[PDB]
Design a protein around this ligand. Structure first.
Ligand SMILES: *[C@H]1O[C@H](CO)[C@H](O)[C@H](O)[C@H]1O
Ligand SMILES: *[C@H]1O[C@H](CO)[C@H](O)[C@H](O)[C@H]1O
Ligand SMILES: *[C@H]1O[C@H](CO)[C@H](O)[C@H](O)[C@H]1O
Ligand SMILES: *[C@H]1O[C@H](CO)[C@H](O)[C@H](O)[C@H]1O
Ligand SMILES: *[C@H]1O[C@H](CO)[C@H](O)[C@H](O)[C@H]1O
Ligand SMILES: OC[C@@H]1O[C@@H](O)[C@H](O)[C@H]1O
Ligand SMILES: OC[C@@H]1O[C@@H](O)[C@H](O)[C@H]1O
Ligand SMILES: OC[C@@H]1O[C@@H](O)[C@H](O)[C@H]1O
Lengths: 45, 48
């Protein structure tokens, strides 16, 4: 006698998870300070 | 009188010496504060 109807294609796995978040991006470069004012002249006599 | 250590004065005819910011030192009266050499430190602003 002939066999039965051959089975279907079994499903795939339930699929993996996603990637976690990234770290906090670093801070901007520390800005430099300004220039010293010019040398003032003598005070009033 | 000359400026005391830790102070500088880069102008003529003034009656006040100014203090040196952190990272710089100064001996007895000098025109400008000189940065600490490589390998040495100075924390405060009255650094001598
Ligand atoms: C199913 O199989 C048998 C023999 O295995 C026969 O050929 C039948 O004709 C077929 O339907
Ligand atoms: C599919 O499966 C059946 C059995 O159910 C049989 O082995 C066939 O030969 C196959 O094609
Ligand atoms: C996976 O499923 C198919 C049919 O869905 C078949 O029964 C296989 O035997 C099973 O491994
Ligand atoms: C700042 O850097 C982090 C990596 O630590 C991340 O890629 C951010 O998207 C970026 O803007
Ligand atoms: C000015 O100062 C900041 C931090 O002190 C930084 O080094 C810059 O490169 C400089 O130009
Ligand atoms: O803001 C940009 C997005 O933020 C979140 C991820 O880190 C990135 O793809
Ligand atoms: O500085 C903030 C937190 O501690 C450190 C980690 O990288 C971050 O998650
Ligand atoms: O080392 C510096 C010298 O000694 C002290 C005065 O600042 C100067 O005369």
């Amino acid at each position: 006698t002939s066999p039965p109807p051959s089975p279907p294609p079994s499903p795939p796995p339930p699929r993996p998870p996603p990637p976690p978040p990234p770290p906090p991006s670093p801070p901007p470069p520390n800005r430099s300070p300004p220039p010293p004012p010019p040398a003032s002249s003598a005070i009033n006599p | 009188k000359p400026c005391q250590p830790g102070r500088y004065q880069n102008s003529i005819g003034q009656r006040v010496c100014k203090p040196c910011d952190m990272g710089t030192y100064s001996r007895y009266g000098g025109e400008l504060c000189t940065k600490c050499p490589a390998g040495t430190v100075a924390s405060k602003t009255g650094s001598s």
